RNA sequence: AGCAGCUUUACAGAUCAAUGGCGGAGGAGGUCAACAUCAAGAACUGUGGGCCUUUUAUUGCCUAUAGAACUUAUAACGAACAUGGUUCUUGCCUUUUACCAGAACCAUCCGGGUGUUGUCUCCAUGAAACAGGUAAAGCUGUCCGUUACUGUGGGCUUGCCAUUUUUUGGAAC
């Protein structure tokens, strides 16, 4: 239950993980959302989880925008 | 079971059949479920544009229906009065709104979440688009909730039923009356909506002209007279000089060619 | 009036009944409703009683019964001895 | 051309009950409830009234097959031509219905269906003034938006009871596709938002204060209603209440036992989900996708309802509505909630005091009534009246005092009213008026003949004798909530038609309570309204129904106000009495804008505002957000009244552009004099102008608050729009939980 | 964006040349 | 059942009770219960021997009520439908 | 419950079984209509000479209450 | 589920006179026909009572009651959509036709719903006999079957699921 790292990993690779393993990816989302909606989170964690939901809601690639990206 | 009979006047289909017809119709069926799509792009706003001699983008153009105060030194210029405002609030933004028909104000913002995309995604799911929601006594042991006998909340056809439920007419219905093949206006929906792509000028002009004809038909109805009497073919059939038979359509067309040729010659 | 031998109170709605109470009075009226306690609703109810002055005539005949017109009346079931049919519905 | 109204007695729809019995309710005050249906735009108020109207009537002539099947709403109360074409309510309408609760006890209920658009907040204010209880209908998707907060606050201030109708639950099931557990979390979130504004008064589904509904699909229910219909028969009667109270919150059930935590290895949902939401979802799911045979047997076995052979042929939406209407029946649980929630013994006295003045109860033998507004109803002009005391009979002579005079008469009374005849009385019926011979305390009724004696609202009374006349109370002018700041100037196209316009403007001024219509000194007419839709509606009424003449109008304008940003640089006197001015403190401006003895007032000023000892005593008047301060007292006290009058004239037409002065404190610094009064007033006005001009005069513009509901990906577009509108700013962005929407709050100059 | 019907990118469902389921001139 | 619903429907009308003690109370029905406990207001009490006394309010235990006379206009209240 | 809330802390006169009368301040009540009285007094006739103060706490059993009158 | 009540379309047993209850003496279709009706105070007929009109024939209004198919509220048989005439104002023009395109007032045309009756096709055919009556009939005489009590089954109620406000006695003298 080290959500602070799960959130950080998901921001960066979740959008590819959703193309490659949509089964486990949507399990990790149903787990992460159950936490957000039903658990007594600490604020600094909570606002980073909610910001991961904003990311999925509107631009799921926006977690890997700012990195250096060499073309394929 | 599916049709009233060989007179072919009424139909009644089951959910999986309607679903299959709706699915086969995707290239020609109507996809705009949100009524707000037509804001300032509907029959009444076109009537207002015509009456006001104002032409909104992509809308039809018509001949004008009609041929100290508000001087610029006394007017406070803050925002230009767009033509869209003149049709949105035609009484407020026009001094002489003659022949204006007040439009429908608005419809609640649509929140229909879309589906049928991934074969095994259920009917009920928390779509990525939704915001999260981040906020002794005893009874008989056999007491249970209503409908507990049914374990399956979502049935195999539930997604289709919800999709058909939101679809525009006629896929919204499971029964109905037959219509003439010529009364199915397949292409009409395309020009009643905004052009789906940035097409060439000649295409956009065709869209506008088709809309113009539609608006004129809506503005000037020609009601049929209730006097159904003396219809031609029924009148002729009553005489001994006309007989009936069944033939191939191509044979009938060739006969009509030969007959018309004889008449004119 | 003669009524069917299988008749329960549930059948006697709109019939005119004589309802006899434990204090010696009778209530006559069209039955509108009844309850598991035998609470009764009598429409257009009239009460009759035999005054103590006239009661001696009943000992081993014309009796001048006193009447009150009540109207729509609720009888509480514990006060009721028995009920008798007087008349059929209209 | 103006309304769909039943003009013929013969065609008035027959009620299912006897109307003579309902009228026999009316002589009992405690068997009448006045219910105001309020809530945001399109929340479903008129549809809820459609349910009550259809329950109450045998056959409605105006009901098409499309409406009976449920393809389109009846919109019975939206019978105006404008309301039909625009698709929203514009005017207050209502109906008097005999409603039975779950114990079959009937009451007369006067329902008032108020418009939801913020532009028509004046009609909502009338509904609040007229009602005992209000049903706040909330759209479950958007939830407690800012307009819901305002309606809740306004209801508390008006001393009405509340019940909340969480409407459009079908959108959770069919539109959003939320799974039932997340729909429960959404409902719980909504209720928690509701409770955050209701002060300490808790609102909960187990208290029946929350009613769940889908007016489109014809159903409403409360937990008590649902239990009595379908669960009470399976459990001991002595346990029904204990069961009902456990159908909400963190309660879990398994095998006849309840727990505050989920049972081990069971993973079931809370009791509300298991006993209420899941079966509702199953009703939706099965009616839409289950085979009619199996469904018919399920509905017979569980709900004991029998589908007719015709119903089996219905199309999906009509069939779903039909099934839901069979299961949920009539609006009995909503009536039961209404009727238990209102308690007159703890609300009615506070209401009557709030709407008039605190004091003694009105004698039972004297007629007293509040003339709420005048309505253009059924092709005639009527007055909406609530009888507060006595009996009003057809043909009675009554005294109608225009409520603008109430303050004057109140002051004169503590130390002549137009008389007119009640030519007709009638109950509200939405599309008909049912005539009655008299009206009792507690009724809301339409009266004809008195509407000529007043403009906005009035007090109707008929004192028995000069003794009781001492105790007569006069109703205050209704607080229309919003202030009309959207402005347009107009004049007739043809001058010959100016008198027709005058008559039409008088009608508008009477039919549109919140409108302010004034003839300016240049001869052009000014109309102030709540917004662009408000103006568009009244202009349509002028051109199409009341004036029937062509009218030239200006582009939209706004009501400015004049103020000062710094103290006056010099004590300049005037002649034809020097006055000075200062920028009023923000705190006092705000509290005066919300309308919140000489020694008491001096305490207020000294403790919260810190004014000095003299200022806290020498305040002569408070007017339109301004203050006059007098700082030998006998030398000045001779003309206090005339000085005040001059100040009143100055504050409504300032020196910059004769616009209202606002937010300034004026202090009288000297007097120029020892038949004299004629000079004192105009000179004091001139002094105020100088007092302002000698400061740093500034112009103030009204700022609209804006509530934007939008899909969340489009928030950049709203951002750009706000950037492109001068002086507009975004102050908040709430996520609407469980939906794709955002609520974006900001400000825009009018 | 990938077409829901045929997976190929470049066109939406309504524009798909494959039946719904579940070189050019110079 | 219906008799109790009828009594709760008489609320606010003038009703006349007779008690087991023989006394008669006529007054406006303020409140009623499934027990038939009733509250009356502005009440004329007739002693069984004929004495008449006025009382501002009376609460009567339902077990002591013999019969209740309600107004006849209740005969077509919705409860009977 | 008997809805006796109106009567709390007020004087009441209870006509109880056996043609007896008791006056007292209603201190509380019960589902059975049992009541507690402060300052209770037995009432015998009109003359106060025949009335008798009862005690500090008096409990009256609910089936014994025929009626109560507000005072 | 068992027990209890109500109800009776079926089966069994008992009964089987009368009387009562219940049910009955074609069905589905047709690119068949005729007739009627389909845009209006939101705007429908009839039976009953009152007034007016009407002058022997019925109209209008008020009141009481019964039924109101189809069509319609972002108004309309038609989720569709042509043409013509007259007048006005325009366009291109070189005169008319043929035309431009806005309006107003009117028509035609291609189609549609519902009701009633007839007809046509296919399939069926314990009582379809005889007589009266009606616009007609499932109306009357008449005929046939079943039913009344019990058992089993079906449907409904949702009662059971002696301790202060009802029904396991403050009554009796
Ligand atoms: N999905 C859904 N739509 C509804 C429901 N109730 C009403 N609507 C729709 O919402 C729109 C507005 O409904 P109204 O009943 O007029 O709402 P309203 O509250 O009276 O609106 P205003 O008075 O104008 O503010 C209509 O299109 C209704 O069909 C509902 O329960 N579910
Ligand atoms: Mg509305
Ligand atoms: Zn494709």
CATH of the domain at C53: 2.30.30.100
Q: Nearest bound ligand to CA D220?
A: 1
Does the residue C25 lie in any domain? yes
Question: Which residues on chain B are in Cβ contact (under 8 Å) with A50?
Answer: 132, 134
B31, E20: Cβ pair inside 8 Å?
no
Q: Tell me the sheet residues that pair with B109.
A: none
* Angle at CA of residue D446, ends D444 and D451, nearest 5°: 120
Q: Whose CA is nearest to atom 10 of ligand 1?
A: D42
Residues 60-79 of C with CB under 7 A from strand H: 76-78
Technique of determination: cryo-EM
- Is F67 at the interface with chain C, CB within 8 A? yes
Distance set, CA B140 to CA D235, D252, D277 (Å): 7, 15, 22
* Domain at F58, CATH number: 2.30.30.100
CA pair distance D4, D45, nearest whole angstrom: 19
**Alpha carbon D572 to its chain's center:** 48
Closest residue by Cα to residue B69 from D486, D658, D492, D559:
D492
**D56 CB under 6 A from ligand 1?**
no
Listing DSSP states for C22-57 in one string gives TTS-EEEEEEEEE-TT--EEEEEEEEEE--TTTGGG
- Is D740 at the interface with chain A, CB within 8 A? yes
Residue in chain B nearest D294 by alpha carbon: B150
Count of C-beta atoms within a 10 Å radius of residue D143: 24
Q: Is the peptide bond before D279 cis (omega within 30 degrees of 0)?
A: no
Residue in chain B nearest E15 by alpha carbon: B27
CA pair distance D271, D206, nearest whole angstrom: 12
Range of the domain at C79: 9-85
The DSSP H or E segment spanning D618 is helix D615-618
User: Which ligand 1 atom lies nearest to the CA of residue D89?
Assistant: 24
Cβ burial, residue B66 (10 Å; 0-12/13-18/19+): exposed
D37, D44, D174, D317: which to mutate for ligand 1, most atoms within 8 A of CB? Answer: D44
Q: Is B161 helix (H, G, I), strand (E, B) or coil?
A: helix
Q: Answer for the pair D379, D373: CB distance below 8 angstroms, yes or no.
A: no
Q: How far is F44 from chain C (nearest CA, A)?
A: 17
Q: Answer for the pair D608, D587: CB distance below 8 angstroms, yes or no.
A: yes
Checking phi first, is residue C71 left (phi over 0); if not, alpha (psi -120 to 50) or beta?
left
The pairs formed by D265-274 with CB atoms below 8 angstroms and a separation of 24 or more are D269/D180, D269/D181, D269/D184, D270/D184, D271/D246, D271/D247, D272/D184, D272/D205, D272/D247, D272/D248, D273/D180, D273/D181, D273/D184, D274/B145
To the nearest 10°, report the CA torsion of D351, D353, D356, D361. Answer: 110
Cβ burial, residue D708 (10 Å; 0-12/13-18/19+): middle
Checking phi first, is residue B242 left (phi over 0); if not, alpha (psi -120 to 50) or beta?
beta
CA pair distance D184, B133, nearest whole angstrom: 10
- Residue D187 in tokens: 């409902």
CA pair distance C7, D16, nearest whole angstrom: 32
The DSSP H or E segment spanning D547 is none
Q: Is D33 helix (H, G, I), strand (E, B) or coil?
A: strand
> Which nucleotide is nearest to F62 if distance is taken from CA to C1'?
H165
The single residue listed with the structure tokens 């031509």 is D81
**D215 CB under 6 A from ligand 1?**
yes
- Residue D458 in tokens: 């009035």
Listing DSSP states for B229-250 in one string gives ---HHHHHHTSTT-------HH
Distance set, CA C4 to CA C7, C33, C88, D612, D675 (Å): 5, 19, 11, 96, 102
CB-nearest to F8 from D16, D24, D103 is D103
List domains and CATH numbers for chain G.
Answer: 1-71 (2.30.30.100)
CA pair distance D667, D690, nearest whole angstrom: 12
User: Which ligand 1 atom lies nearest to the CA of residue D40?
Assistant: 25
For strand H, give the nucleotides within 7 A of a protein CB: 5-7, 29-35, 37-39, 41-44, 62-63, 65, 68, 70-83, 101-104, 106-113, 149, 156-159, 161, 164-167
CA pair distance C19, C82, nearest whole angstrom: 6
Q: Using only C-alpha atoms, what is the Rg of chain F?
A: 12
B132, A46: Cβ pair inside 8 Å?
no
Closest residue by Cα to residue D57 from D371, D330, D393, D359:
D330
* Angle at CA of residue D132, ends D126 and D137, nearest 5°: 75
Q: What is the 3-state secondary structure (H, E, C) of D196-240?
A: HHCCCCCCCHHHCCEEEEECCCCEEECHHHHHHHHCHHHCCHHHH
At D93, give phi and psi (nearest 5°): -135, 170
Which site among A56, A58, A60, A61 would you substitute to test the D interface, given the most D Cβ atoms closer than 10 Å to its Cβ?
Answer: A58
Per CATH, is D483-559 categorized as 3.40.228.10? Answer: no
G66, F55: Cβ pair inside 8 Å?
no
Total structural domains in chain F?
Answer: 1
Distance B9 CA to H114 C1' (A): 14
User: Do C and F count as touching (3 or more CB pairs closer than 8 A)?
Assistant: yes
Distance F6 CA to H129 C1' (A): 60
User: Do C and A count as touching (3 or more CB pairs closer than 8 A)?
Assistant: no
Q: Is B57 helix (H, G, I), strand (E, B) or coil?
A: coil
CA pair distance E8, D72, nearest whole angstrom: 41
Range of the domain at F75: 1-79
CA pair distance F17, F25, nearest whole angstrom: 5
- The verdict on whether residue D175 carries a ligand-binding annotation is no
CB-nearest to B165 from D234, D286, D317 is D317
User: Do E and G count as touching (3 or more CB pairs closer than 8 A)?
Assistant: no
CA pair distance B166, B159, nearest whole angstrom: 11
CB-nearest to D539 from B91, B113, B123 is B91
Total structural domains in chain C?
Answer: 1
* Mutual angle of helices D223-230 and D332-341, in 10-degree steps: 130
What is the edge-to-edge ordering of all strands in the sheet holding D433-435?
D419-421, D397-402, D458-462, D367-377, D380-389, D444-448, D424-428, D433-435
Q: Answer for the pair D582, D564: CB distance below 8 angstroms, yes or no.
A: yes
């Amino acid at each position: 239950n080290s959500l602070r790292l799960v959130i950080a990993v998901m921001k960066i690779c979740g959008w590819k993980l959703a193309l490659v393993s949509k089964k486990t990816h949507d399990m990790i989302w149903e787990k992460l959302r159950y936490i957000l909606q039903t658990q007594e989170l600490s604020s600094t964690l909570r606002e980073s989880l909610e910001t991961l939901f904003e990311i999925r809601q509107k631009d799921y690639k926006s977690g890997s925008q700012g990195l250096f990206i060499l073309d394929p | 079971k599916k049709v009233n009979g060989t007179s072919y006047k009424k139909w009644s289909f089951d959910l999986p059949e309607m679903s299959n017809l709706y699915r086969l119709s995707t290239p020609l069926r109507d996809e705009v479920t949100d009524k707000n799509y037509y804001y300032l792009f509907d029959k009444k706003s076109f009537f207002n544009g015509k009456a006001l001699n104002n032409a909104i983008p992509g809308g039809p153009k018509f001949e004008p229906l009609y041929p100290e105060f508000n001087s610029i030194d006394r007017v406070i210029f803050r925002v230009p009065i767009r033509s869209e405002y003149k049709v949105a609030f035609p009484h407020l933004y026009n001094s002489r709104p003659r022949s204006v028909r007040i439009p429908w104000y608005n419809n609640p913002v649509s929140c229909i979440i879309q589906n049928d995309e991934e074969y095994d995604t259920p009917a009920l799911f928390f779509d990525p688009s939704l915001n999260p929601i981040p906020h002794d006594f005893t009874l008989p042991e056999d007491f249970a909730p209503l409908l507990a006998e049914e374990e399956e909340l979502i049935l195999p056809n539930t997604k289709d039923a919800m999709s058909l439920y939101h679809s525009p007419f006629p896929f919204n219905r499971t029964k109905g009356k037959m219509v003439r093949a010529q009364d199915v206006a397949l292409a009409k929906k395309w020009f009643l909506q905004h052009p789906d792509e940035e097409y060439p000028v000649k295409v956009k002009v065709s869209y506008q002209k088709l809309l113009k004809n539609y608006v004129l038909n809506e503005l000037h109805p020609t009601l049929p007279t209730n006097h159904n009497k003396t219809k031609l073919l029924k009148s002729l059939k009553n005489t001994k000089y006309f007989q009936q038979t069944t033939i191939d359509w191509v044979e009938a067309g060739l006969q009509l060619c030969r007959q018309g040729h004889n008449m004119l010659n | 009036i003669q009524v069917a031998h299988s008749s329960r109170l549930a059948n006697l709605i709109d019939y005119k009944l004589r309802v006899l109470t434990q204090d010696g009075r009778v209530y006559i009226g069209q039955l509108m409703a009844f309850d598991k306690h035998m609470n009764l609703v009598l429409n257009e109810c009239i009460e009759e009683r035999v005054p103590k002055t006239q009661l001696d005539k009943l000992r081993p005949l014309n009796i001048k019964v006193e009447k009150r017109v009540l109207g729509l009346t609720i009888l509480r079931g514990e006060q009721i001895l028995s009920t008798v049919v007087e008349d059929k519905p209209l | 051309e103006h309304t769909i109204f039943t003009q013929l007695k013969k065609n008035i729809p027959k009620t299912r009950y006897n109307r003579d019995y309902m009228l026999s309710m009316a002589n009992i005050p405690e068997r009448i409830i006045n219910v105001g249906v309020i809530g945001p735009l399109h929340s479903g108020k008129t549809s809820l009234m459609d349910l009550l109207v259809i329950d109450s009537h045998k056959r409605i002539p105006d009901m098409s097959k499309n409406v009976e099947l449920g393809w389109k709403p009846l919109r019975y109360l939206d019978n105006l031509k404008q309301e039909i074409d625009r698709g929203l309510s514009i005017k207050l309408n209502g109906s008097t219905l005999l409603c039975t609760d779950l114990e079959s006890k009937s009451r007369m209920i006067n329902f008032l269906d108020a418009p939801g658009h913020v532009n028509f907040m004046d009609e909502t204010a009338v509904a609040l003034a007229a009602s005992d209880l209000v049903l706040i209908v909330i759209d479950v998707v958007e939830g407690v938006t800012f307009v819901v907060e305002q309606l809740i606050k306004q209801s508390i201030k008006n001393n009405v009871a509340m019940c909340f109708v969480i409407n459009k639950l079908d959108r959770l099931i069919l539109d959003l596709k939320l799974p039932p557990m997340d729909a429960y979390l959404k409902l719980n979130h909504i209720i928690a938002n509701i409770n955050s504004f209701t002060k300490g008064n808790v609102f909960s589904p187990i208290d029946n204060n929350i009613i769940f509904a889908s007016t489109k699909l014809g159903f409403t229910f409360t937990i008590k209603e649902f239990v009595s219909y379908y669960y009470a028969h399976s459990i001991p009667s002595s346990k029904i209440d204990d069961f009902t109270t456990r159908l909400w919150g963190s309660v879990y059930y398994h095998k006849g036992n309840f727990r505050t935590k989920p049972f081990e290895n069971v993973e079931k949902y809370p009791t509300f989900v298991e006993f209420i939401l899941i079966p509702l979802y199953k009703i939706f799911s099965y009616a839409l996708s289950m085979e009619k045979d199996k469904l018919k047997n399920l509905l017979r076995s569980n709900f004991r309802v029998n589908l007719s052979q015709e119903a089996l042929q219905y199309d999906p939406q009509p069939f779903l509505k039909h099934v839901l209407q069979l299961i949920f029946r009539q609006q009995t649980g909503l009536v039961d909630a209404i009727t238990r929630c209102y308690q007159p013994f703890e609300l009615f006295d506070n209401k009557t005091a709030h709407l008039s003045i605190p004091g003694k109860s009105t004698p039972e033998g004297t007629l007293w009534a509040h003339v709420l507004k005048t309505v253009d109803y059924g092709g005639a002009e009527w007055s909406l009246v609530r009888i507060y005391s006595g009996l009003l009979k057809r043909g009675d002579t009554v005294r109608i005092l225009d409520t603008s005079q109430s303050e004057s008469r109140q002051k004169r009374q503590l130390h002549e009213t137009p008389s007119c005849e009640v030519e007709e009385i009638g109950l509200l019926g939405g599309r008909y008026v049912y005539p009655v011979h008299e009206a009792h305390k507690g009724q809301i009724v339409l009266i004809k003949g008195i509407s000529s004696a007043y403009i906005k609202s009035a007090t109707l009374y008929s004192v028995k004798s000069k003794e009781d006349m001492k105790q007569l109370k006069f109703f205050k002018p209704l607080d229309y909530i919003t202030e009309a700041v959207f402005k347009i100037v107009l004049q007739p196209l043809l001058p010959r038609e100016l008198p027709k316009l005058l008559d039409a403007l008088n009608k508008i001024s009477k039919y549109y309570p919140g409108v302010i219509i004034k003839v300016e000194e240049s001869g052009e007419h000014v109309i102030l309204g709540n917004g662009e839709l408000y103006m568009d509606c009244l202009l349509y009424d002028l051109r199409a129904s009341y004036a029937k003449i062509e009218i030239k109008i200006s582009d939209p304008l706004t009501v400015f106000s004049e103020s000062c940003s710094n103290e006056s640089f010099a004590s300049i006197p005037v002649s034809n009495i020097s006055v000075a001015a200062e920028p009023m403190d923000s705190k006092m401006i705000q509290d005066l804008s919300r309308n919140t003895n000489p020694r008491k007032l001096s305490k207020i000023l000294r403790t919260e505002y810190g004014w000095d000892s003299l200022a806290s005593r020498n305040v002569w008047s408070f007017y339109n957000g301004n203050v006059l301060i007098n700082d030998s007292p006998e030398l000045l006290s001779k003309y206090k009244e005339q000085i005040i009058q001059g100040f009143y004239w100055a504050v409504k037409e300032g020196p910059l552009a004769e616009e209202p002065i606002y937010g300034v404190q004026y202090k009288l610094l000297s007097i120029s004099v020892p038949v004299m009064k004629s000079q004192i007033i105009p000179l004091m006005k001139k002094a105020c102008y100088v007092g302002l001009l000698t400061a740093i005069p500034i112009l103030l513009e009204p700022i609209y608050e804006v509530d934007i509901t939008v899909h969340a990906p489009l928030l950049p577009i709203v951002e750009e729009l706000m950037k492109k509108r001068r002086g507009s700013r975004i102050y908040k962005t709430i996520k609407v939980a469980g939906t794709p929407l955002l609520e974006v709050r900001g400000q825009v100059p009018v | 964006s990938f077409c829901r019907n045929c997976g190929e990118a470049g066109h939406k469902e309504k524009d798909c040349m494959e039946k719904p389921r579940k070189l050019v001139r110079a | 059942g219906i008799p109790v619903k009828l009594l709760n429907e008489a609320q606010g009308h003038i009703v006349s009770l007779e008690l087991t003690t023989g006394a008669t109370y006529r007054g406006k029905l303020v409140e009623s219960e499934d027990s038939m406990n009733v509250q009356l207001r502005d009440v004329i009490a007739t002693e069984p021997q004929g004495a008449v006394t006025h009382m501002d309010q009376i609460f009567v235990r339902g077990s002591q009520i013999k019969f209740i006379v309600v107004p006849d206009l209740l005969k077509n209240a919705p409860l009977f439908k | 419950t008997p809805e006796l809330k109106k009567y709390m802390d007020k004087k009441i006169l209870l006509n109880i079984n056996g043609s007896r009368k008791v006056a007292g301040i209603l201190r509380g009540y019960d589902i059975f209509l049992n009541v507690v009285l402060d300052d209770a007094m037995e009432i015998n006739g009109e003359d106060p000479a025949n009335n008798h103060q009862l005690g500090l706490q008096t409990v009256i059993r609910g089936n014994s209450i025929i009626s109560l009158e507000a005072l």
